[PDB]
Amino acid sequence: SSGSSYPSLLQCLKAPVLSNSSCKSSYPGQITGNMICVGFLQGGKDSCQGDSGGPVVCNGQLQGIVSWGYGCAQKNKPGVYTKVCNYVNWIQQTIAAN
């Protein structure tokens, strides 16, 4: 929460998908339909600088990409992730054209 330390070993964290009202309550006017919040409102458990681009996998499917937040593990500031389910077509289209 305070300080710094990027690990040499791979770190893991189990966290649930937060309902968009809980997500939207935390960041007024800043959450789009291409974003989802995953984590805990109490803080202490979150992804941070260096985890960016990383996977958020639930039920064997990649549902999110570590994107942003206000700091890391702050109370009532859960992490915000790119909503991958909205991007399957762009990903397939792109892979086919390149």
Partner: protein
Amino acid sequence: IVGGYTCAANSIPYQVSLNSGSHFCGGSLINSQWVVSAAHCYKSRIQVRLGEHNIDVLEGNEQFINAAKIITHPNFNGNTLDNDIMLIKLSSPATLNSRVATVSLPRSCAAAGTECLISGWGNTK
């Protein structure tokens, strides 16, 4: 990852490390030829490292392949971070095995309360 635990060695086979001298961002292998990441992680030069657990030691199970093409989403917005996604094509296809595997894309969006697993070598404090 703050407040997490150390993953079992190679228990997250689709997890890749973007390297440009040192690890800067994570990513996911969704194809033997393609990695998905965050558009705000963009660098013109990137080396993808697969099969990693300890990024500071060559354990033997790693495959380092440079990206040949990096494609960020055309509507990515730096102010809002809307469409924060980037696709990276490897210069040579990764060899899928026990410690190196793809992750399925979603069949549909996830319901609220769905437990997920998050991983990476980011800050722990």
